[PDB]
Design a binder for this molecule. Structure first.
Ligand SMILES: C[S@+](CC[C@H](N)C(=O)O)C[C@H]1O[C@@H](n2cnc3c(N)ncnc32)[C@H](O)[C@@H]1OP(=O)(O)OC[C@H]1O[C@@H](n2cnc3c(N)ncnc32)[C@H](O)[C@@H]1O
Ligand SMILES: [Mn+2]
Length: 251
């Protein structure tokens, strides 16, 4: 069986996947996608060419199946119903019998379980900082993202019980998490988007499903990971109601 890898949205783990695939002479396609455009249809041409074509197995790495996969397609993912699975990076390495070196295992732990993940395999303070900086960079965060993050923390943050609630107009949320960490619970929202981080995502999922179909929701990172809504799918009043419901859990 011959492998073809189709890559989803970029971050440090996806960049590490590119390196391993490049080193191992694997057939792969990388359209420089991001978290909010990682659609299988970005690779429609490749699906037409290799789909249902006997020798090949097509591995889709964190791609939304907006078109019907062919019979030789395998989804590689660790979100939603697969939120307990290892990072896509670890799954790809296993497919290729690739032993992850130390840096790569830190990348994988950060990708699946953030700073807590890196701490439980003994990452140092310098290692954690390099990984976070390189992850934000691979996501495309820039200076104006980091500036808006500081603004939201100074002027748009309030703490209710153990829950931080941050209103922001920032495009990228990861700079906010990295500035507020450590925290137990964090809710970041905009007029048309929210992401919740930390303890008890399952009760957050119960709230979200009263307002929107599951196709507008994503989660991962484990029991106390993250759960969010796809940008511009919910109205401001729906977001505001959800925010109130999440605050009520602190009572
Ligand atoms: C938590 S991140 C924040 C995205 C947010 N849009 C932003 O602006 O920064 C978003 C995750 O949701 C996924 N996602 C799915 N669909 C969409 C969509 N339509 N729009 C946006 N995001 C979508 C996306 O792939 C990513 O998962 P990943 O697994 O690829 O990456 C996880 C990232 O979060 C970090 N992370 C992992 N666990 C945690 C945690 N518990 N707390 C904070 N960060 C974590 C990890 O280091 C890595 O950088
Ligand atoms: Mn990813």
């Amino acid at each position: 069986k011959k492998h073809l890898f189709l890559l989803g949205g970029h971050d440090l783990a996806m960049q590490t996947i590119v390196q391993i695939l490049t080193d191992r002479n694997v057939i792969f396609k990388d359209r420089y996608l991001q978290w909010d455009n990682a659609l299988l249809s970005q690779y429609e041409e490749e699906i037409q060419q290799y789909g249902n074509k006997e020798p090949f197995i097509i591995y889709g790495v964190e791609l939304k199946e907006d078109i019907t996969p062919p019979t030789n397609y395998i989804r590689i993912d660790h979100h939603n119903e697969y939120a307990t699975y290892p990072s896509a990076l670890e799954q790809v390495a296993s497919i290729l019998d690739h032993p992850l070196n130390r840096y790569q295992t830190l990348v994988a732990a950060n990708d699946k379980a953030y700073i807590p993940g890196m701490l439980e395999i003994g990452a140092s303070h310098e290692e954690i900082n390099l990984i976070r900086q390189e992850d934000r960079k691979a996501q495309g965060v820039i200076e104006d993202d980091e500036k808006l993050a500081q603004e939201a923390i100074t002027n748009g943050t309030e703490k209710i019980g153990s829950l931080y609630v941050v209103f922001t107009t920032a495009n990228k949320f990861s700079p906010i998490c990295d500035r507020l960490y450590p925290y137990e619970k964090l809710l970041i929202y905009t007029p048309n988007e929210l992401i919740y981080y930390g303890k008890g995502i399952n009760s957050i999922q119960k709230i979200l499903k009263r307002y929107t179909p599951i196709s507008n929701i994503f989660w991962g990172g484990g029991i106390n990971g993250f759960i969010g809504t796809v940008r511009n799918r919910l109205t401001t009043n729906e977001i505001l109601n959800i925010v109130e419901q999440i605050k009520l859990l602190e009572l």
